[PDB]
Amino acid sequence: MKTWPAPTAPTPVRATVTVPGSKSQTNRALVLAALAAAQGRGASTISGALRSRDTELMLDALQTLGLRVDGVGSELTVSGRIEPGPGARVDCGLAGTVLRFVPPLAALGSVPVTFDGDQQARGRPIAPLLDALRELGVAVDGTGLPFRVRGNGSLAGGTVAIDASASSQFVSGLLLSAASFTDGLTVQHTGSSLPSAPHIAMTAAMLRQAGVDIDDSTPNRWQVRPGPVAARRWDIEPDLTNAVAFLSAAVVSGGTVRITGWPRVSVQPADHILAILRQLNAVVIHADSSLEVRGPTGYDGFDVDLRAVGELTPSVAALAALASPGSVSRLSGIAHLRGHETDRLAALSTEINRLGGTCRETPDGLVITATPLRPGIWRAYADHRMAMAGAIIGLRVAGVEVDDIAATTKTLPEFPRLWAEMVG
């Protein structure tokens, strides 16, 4: 595979960028549309849907379960029933949302469904959710990929306790289908350290838009009452995590990037994101239904807690590597990133140090000292966000090439073109 050379920015980037739909919201919408359709409420359409490997895996997973998903562009229509064929096998790829959100959904069917995924997906956490499904009555063969969910057309629900410290998607995955369990569900996260609170809140918010009653008034506990899931039209926001890769270009070059269609009120953690950018003295404004970010002339080291927004770590690590020389930055709260697409703390450490940088993995994150960097091959680990972090570095370091920019197809198949258009 040819490498992809990351274009440099010898002068401030200036651009208006449109990023496609949110992966997290798209895949929640597809699951909820499938439940409504499986419940006999009719077809649903998702407008502005992300088309990427993770959402194609999700819609193929629903089709494996018997549903129909139509649409060649960003408008997807879900219909039909859960009625899996003999030997049904969901391919999870490297999509945690498919791996975690579809096995509950599938216990509603009356035929078992096998789950498999990429070799690299088999190293990602999944066993706690399968134990929880077993506690709720579902027969599950296997404690890791490949595993089979042997449903008998129904799932009684009830109360269940789970350690979800390794992934909020263990909670989201159970919450999304719980309205179709006979008794609904009460889910209790045991212990502490629950990452990605905004993605669980995302789940709860979209469940309420589908008419589902969910009580999240007590931390670490969620009660969902049994009831209908409405068929409705979903409007998908731009992916704000992907937007940060482009906004970072403004930050490191002292330029100006605008993102179109930014929601002033979002189901995504927009407030965390904008606060972080302002930590680096970026000027952030909302204008013309767009978000504008103007980078500072330079920035020093920063400390940032990424527990609630860990998927920002690759881009934020790149920003830290590009701070003024001798700056020290501390990224914390992200032990769980050892279980992501790749171990992102080891990978970021490895690739930054290869460019001559200074990145030290810590038990919950990274400490990065900004030092002059040099050309190299920034290696993707099949991880869309590692790939875009390489692009960010390359803005300020000539001679940086990403081995596998096509890794970006996970959530942004058009990255290479959009990025070229931005940097110009």
Question: Catalytic residues, which ones?
Answer: 311
344 is a contact residue toward ligand S3P (CB under 6 A): no
Query: Is 168 a binder of ligand S3P (CB under 6 A)?
Result: yes
The answer to whether 336 is a known ligand-binding residue is: no
Widest CA span in the chain: 62
- Residue 24 assigned ligand-binding role: yes
Comparison of 171 and 397: residue with beta carbon closer to ligand S3P: 171
Contact stretch for ligand S3P (CB under 6 A) within 167-175, 253-261, 313-321, 365-373: 167-175
Q: Which of 48, 109, 112, 195 binds ligand S3P (CB under 6 A)?
A: 195
Q: How far apart are CB 246 and ligand S3P at their closest, in Å? A: 18
Least distance in Å: CB of 274 to ligand S3P?
A: 18
- Edge-to-edge strand order for the sheet containing 283-287? 14-17, 256-260, 290-294, 283-287
- Would you count residue 167 as binding ligand S3P (CB under 6 A)? yes
| Residue 22 makes contact with ligand S3P by CB under 6 A | no
Strand partners, 224: 185, 214
Does 97 contact ligand S3P by CB under 6 A? yes
Minimum CB separation of residue 172 from ligand S3P in Å reads: 5
Query: Is 196 labelled as part of a ligand binding site?
Result: yes
Q: Does 2 belong to an annotated binding site?
A: no
Distance CA 73, CA 417 (A): 18
What the block records as the tokens of 80 is 């039909």
- Exposure b/e, 355-379, CB count within 10 A at least 16 = b: bebebebeebbbbbbbbebeebebb
Residue 417 burial (CB < 10 Å; 0-12/13-18/19+)?
Answer: exposed
Query: CB count, 10 Å around CB of 191?
Result: 11
Q: Rule CB under 6 A: is residue 196 a binding residue for ligand S3P?
A: yes
Strands (E) located in 168-314: 185-189, 214-215, 221-224, 234-235, 256-260, 283-287, 290-294, 303-305
Q: Where are the beta strands (DSSP E) in 110-150?
A: 113-116, 140-141, 147-149
Q: Does residue 242 belong to the site contacting ligand S3P (CB under 6 A)? A: no
Q: Are the C-beta atoms of 360 and 320 separated by less than 8 Å?
A: no
- Measured from the CB atom, the residue of 170 and 246 that comes closer to ligand S3P is 170
Known binding residues for 3-phosphoshikimate are: 23-24, 28, 167-169, 196, 311, 340
Known binding residues for phosphoenolpyruvate are: 23, 96, 124, 169, 344, 385, 410
Query: Which residues contact ligand S3P by CB under 6 A?
Result: 24, 96-97, 167-169, 172, 195-196, 199, 310-311, 336
